[PDB]
Design a protein around this ligand. Sequence first.
Ligand SMILES: Cc1cc2c(C(N)=O)cccc2n1-c1nc2c(c(NCc3ccccc3)n1)COCC2
Ligand SMILES: Cc1cc2c(C(N)=O)cccc2n1-c1nc2c(c(NCc3ccccc3)n1)COCC2
Lengths: 86, 509, 509
Amino acid sequence: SPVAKDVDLEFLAKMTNGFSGADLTEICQRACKLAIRESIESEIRRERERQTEIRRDHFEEAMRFARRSVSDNDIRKYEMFAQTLQ
Amino acid sequence: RKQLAQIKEMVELPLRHPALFKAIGVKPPRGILLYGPPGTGKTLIARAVANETGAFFFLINGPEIMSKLAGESESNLRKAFEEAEKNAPAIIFIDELDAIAPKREKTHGEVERRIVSQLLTLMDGLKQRAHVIVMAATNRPNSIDPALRRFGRFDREVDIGIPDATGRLEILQIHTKNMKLADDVDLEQVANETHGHVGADLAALCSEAALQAIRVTMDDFRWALSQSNPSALRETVVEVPQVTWEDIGGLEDVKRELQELVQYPVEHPDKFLKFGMTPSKGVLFYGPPGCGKTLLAKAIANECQANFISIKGPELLTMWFGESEANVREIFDKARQAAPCVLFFDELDSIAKARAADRVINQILTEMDGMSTKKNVFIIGATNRPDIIDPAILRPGRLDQLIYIPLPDEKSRVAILKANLRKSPVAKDVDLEFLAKMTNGFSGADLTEICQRACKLAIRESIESEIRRERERQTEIRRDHFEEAMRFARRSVSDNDIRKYEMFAQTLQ
Amino acid sequence: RKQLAQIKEMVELPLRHPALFKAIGVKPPRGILLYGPPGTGKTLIARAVANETGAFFFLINGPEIMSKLAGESESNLRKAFEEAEKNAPAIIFIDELDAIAPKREKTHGEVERRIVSQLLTLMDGLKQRAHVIVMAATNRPNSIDPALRRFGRFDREVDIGIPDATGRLEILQIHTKNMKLADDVDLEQVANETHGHVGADLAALCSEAALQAIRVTMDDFRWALSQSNPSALRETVVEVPQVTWEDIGGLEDVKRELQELVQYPVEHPDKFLKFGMTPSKGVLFYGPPGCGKTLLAKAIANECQANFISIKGPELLTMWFGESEANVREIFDKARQAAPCVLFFDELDSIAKARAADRVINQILTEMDGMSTKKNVFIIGATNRPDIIDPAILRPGRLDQLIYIPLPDEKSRVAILKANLRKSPVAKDVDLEFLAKMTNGFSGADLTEICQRACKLAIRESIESEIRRERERQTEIRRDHFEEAMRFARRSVSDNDIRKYEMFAQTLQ
Ligand SMILES: Cc1cc2c(C(N)=O)cccc2n1-c1nc2c(c(NCc3ccccc3)n1)COCC2
Ligand SMILES: Cc1cc2c(C(N)=O)cccc2n1-c1nc2c(c(NCc3ccccc3)n1)COCC2
């Protein structure tokens, strides 16, 4: 993927404490779809105006609706069931 | 001095400017009733008002009247009343009124009923013509026989409650101007630390502070504080709180909502009168338990410079489990009298949760219904369970407006770290936004327990090192501490719950 | 003598050094109220303080006043008060105050209300100017009419409760200095054995001890102990316990936790004041039923040389089932007055378990809320069921800190064997670590019942052999006993349960 270096991924590490892979994934995918959208929308806009990479804008855009998959309850449940499974 | 002002506006003008009222075709008050807890110097106040109006003063020590042989009591009363009547402008002040004139089935004998009757007839007997005012003392007006709070008798009532920081400070200054006060002594400190104290308790405090010096440093004051057992711990404190809105960083929408609900009709009433629509009776704060639902309610009172009253739910529980719903009436009376004011119910869900109960919640209903719209007294209902509150409370003309007081924002997280660390040693390499980001989904409570855990790590390291230095002599707080403290610190409220308020926020609407 | 000290600090300086206070601009106390059970010689104490201050002493035997014809009572009172007023420095001491001045709806007649009124007016009448102090006696201040515990009247209150071992010892020495005391007699033994005894019961004990000699050996004392029925069995014993931390071997983490919670703010307050954070209100001990949750709580009080008060849960149950939640207020007052102190609730789960109940637990709430933070009184809540405690109790500012008090460690097992066998014959071939290892997963209770079973095997073998030697004449404890005793001895608490506290320890956090 095209990813400019002003996508620091540790800004993303910290913010995504308690996140499952799935959420990181859907963050990335939402970003990528915002990018594609902006891209071809702008290209079609440029077709219509001719007939007279991905950056943390996209990402904090994408995180502005992105979950934390698994709730404390559950993880606590594996904790419990990890201890008492042992 | 604020207190005197009222009593002088009620006394002076119809004691020593009487002709204007009797010409303008009205009546002076003939029965000004002072009440509030003991340790308040109501007597002092009465004589103060008599001296500073310029009027004859006659004390009636209730005990003294009640100690006489049946007859000589009534005699003493008549005597007092004629003695005042004759020397008037006259204040007759009745100390411990409740003594002679109680709640009158707690009177296993007819002599007292005669004695009270007498006082009623005497109270009736006066003329505004005769230039006589009767003041009287008691803990609460519930104490006195209601046939004294007739219009003909003790019509006007003044509450001299607990004093607040400033009053306490004034009192301390007044009792300690005559004292060997050290430079390290802080009066304001003590004034702030002296919750539930009254004039008496503060006097006593100053006294033990003296005595233990005489065995005055700050140590002595703090020690005397360690010793003192204030009287008015148990009394419901009414004061305007000193939490600013800008102390509560963020939570903006709620600021503006609360302003539109409670601020606009006290601060721009012209408008509400103009458009004609009349204000919300009150509010309901719901959301997760880790927040300053209290503090917002305070903050809007502070913002409207109006009073504040917390009913902790254990008050409610105590009422339900005891079936003393009566006392709701008394609470609302107490708010009404201390207008303008926010009556803040904490844990409104308690009565309803814990299962004359819906009745305790219901007395609050009948009282919200019966309370006059115009009196500017707002009434904020806290919970965490909109789901359990008798929904009659959420009927319009009651707790009309619902507000989701949600988890703190970053600005607010910062605000709360700041609040929790206000008085503390905090080196600047504790950035609080490192702490803002890490604590997404955290309740106040968690920020708090982070701060406290840190502080305890600091104290621990400190005195452990000091004792280690005692043992080695007998041959500030920094993000080390904090990331130490966060390395066991929760996220209070689980997604489930917040999603539950979300859901119940949407579908409550 | 410790007791007198206080009363002399309250009396002497404003009886016989009065000008300093009245100049420095404060007030002496004019009503020092002594209370506590009968058998305490409050009268003796008053006259002691009057003689050792140098002051006129006037007794008012309540019964004597109440026995007069209505009128001559008030007469007697006025008389007494003027007689004192005239001869002053003056202590007016009122024996059985509750007699003249009771809880005043328990007064089926107006004469008593007049008599009390009189005493109120007389109490009001005094000046610090007149050099007069009024002391007074009763069982508990609940007895007296509250309008006597006004500031104007009996403001200062002193508790002369049960005496502890040392007091009992002093008293025994004092009553038995005049006695044919044998060499085998042990006063301290008896002092330690005399729980619930007061001055009177001890006097009586010494007396029967005499009389049965005169029919004094240790036998006589122990026999008189066998006979005596002390008065204050029923009274809630406040004393600093004498269990060291090092009596409680191991359980270290809890030691240090409890120290950081309860020790650091009484022993290094400078620090808590410095960092600014204010201490835990209290604690909650949970875990398995076989442990010394009591003893830890004692041990931290002992460590902080603070008092201790056990509310056994049967006190709680008695309150709930009777709906005498009132008495919580009285308990906290009793702790507050006996500061610093640990108020230890045992089986806090009882009220809640056994199903104005959440109210009894709730009164404890309102009291924890209303108790002043600064007063150094800690408040430890025992259970075995964190799961059942009204979680409002586990809300911050209440029982903030949870502590899992788990099963004893080997050091602690040893400690408990040692404790259970302290006074016993134990040959050195009872190694206690053989016993430490074998008893992994055991509660104190099991170690205890091991020891007891052993001891009973020993007694059995002993007296069986002695009787066998009587029958054959009419022609220490060793690991034999112990491995005998363990050959039927449980493991109290099952893995399930401990795993349950583990789980509920983790997920409680
Ligand atoms: C010391 C403290 C603990 C605490 C807790 C808690 N769970 O322990 C919850 C809420 C507020 C809390 N505060 C607190 N206390 C204060 C303030 C403040 N922040 C502004 C605010 C309040 C509620 C919301 C947003 C932001 N927060 C404001 O200054 C005075 C006292
Ligand atoms: C007599 C006795 C019975 C008992 C029991 C019991 N269920 O019988 C449980 C725990 C301690 C017990 N003690 C006991 N009592 C004492 C001590 C002590 N050892 C240290 C200890 C205390 C609490 C906890 C751990 C270990 N143990 C210390 O000496 C004074 C009294």
